[PDB]
Design a protein around this ligand. Structure first.
Ligand SMILES: O=C(NCc1ccc(NS(=O)(=O)C2CC2)cc1C(F)(F)F)c1ccc2c(ccn2Cc2cccc(F)c2)c1
Length: 257
């Protein structure tokens, strides 16, 4: 932040641009989520699924299957949302279409887990764009091996939510994730890394401006990009299981290779 000059003003314009398209691409923001989770919102208070009884009034193996079929459904519409946003990242549509598909191939699950944290508190998660709330302990209590399917998310979210990012912060963060230069099968790492470096400059200036009394928030955020890789691997391992135990075409395209 040290200087107010043309370079720092471009980085603010890039942050504004990302925020606006974020707001356009993501109906349920962290600000709206935090409002629903605190009772303040105008929107009719969401129904709380906390046991088998409350799940029935909301709508065993059938209870589990149904829940995971919604998570597959919402995850598909979540990929649409994130596709829209990526298109708004200055530069992104000027890379080999192959690289674009790649960057998004490996990106969506990391963003999903990132933005899922926005919908979470200690007690549980907002579902169906804020109309429901499903508790951590209920999800936990589901038949093995689906029973332990969100716990990693809740664990991630607890530590992620303690950073106290807002929508402005997350917009740039989410862009930094999509423009990851280490994804398999990238043709041109240079142009990708080049955009990410500018995004990383915009994030840093954003975190300095937005979190005055917040030590190494930049470093801690970049370390979260490490937690996310690990979480995505552990999901895949869990689905490598369901294959033998018990997805959606576009999720199958992403899980392949
Ligand atoms: O928003 C949902 N889930 C978000 C989500 C996304 C991904 C995941 N994890 S994942 O899939 O592993 C990710 C990598 C791709 C988990 C969730 C979670 F539920 F935990 F929050 C949601 C939940 C229930 C829904 C539906 C749709 C139908 N059900 C039933 C119903 C329950 C209550 C009322 C009702 F009308 C339907 C959608």
């Amino acid at each position: 932040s040290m200087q107010l000059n043309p370079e720092s003003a471009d980085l603010r314009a890039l942050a504004k641009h990302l925020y606006d398209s974020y707001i356009k691409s993501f109906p349920l923001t962290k600000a709206k989520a935090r409002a629903i989770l605190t009772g303040k919102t105008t929107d009719k208070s969401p129904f709380v699924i906390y046991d088998m009884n409350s799940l029935m009034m909301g709508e065993s193996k059938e209870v589990a299957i149904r829940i995971f079929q919604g998570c597959q459904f919402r995850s598909v519409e979540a990929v649409q949302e994130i596709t829209e946003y990526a298109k708004s990242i200055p530069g992104f549509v000027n890379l080999d279409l192959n690289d674009q598909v790649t960057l998004l191939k490996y990106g969506v699950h990391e963003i999903i887990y990132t933005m899922l944290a926005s919908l979470m508190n200690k007690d549980g998660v907002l579902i169906s764009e804020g109309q429901g709330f499903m508790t951590r302990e209920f999800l936990k209590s589901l038949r093995k091996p689906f029973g332990d399917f969100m716990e990693p998310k809740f664990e991630f979210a607890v530590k992620f939510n303690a950073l106290e990012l807002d929508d402005s912060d997350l917009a740039i963060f989410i862009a930094v994730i999509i423009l990851s230069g280490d994804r398999p099968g990238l043709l041109n790492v240079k142009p990708i890394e080049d955009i990410q470096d500018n995004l990383l400059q915009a994030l840093e200036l954003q975190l300095k401006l937005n979190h005055p009394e917040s030590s190494q928030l930049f470093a801690k955020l970049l370390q979260k990009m490490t937690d996310l890789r690990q979480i995505v691997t552990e999901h895949v391992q869990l689905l490598q299981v369901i294959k033998k135990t018990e997805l959606h075409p576009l999720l199958q395209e992403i899980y392949k290779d």
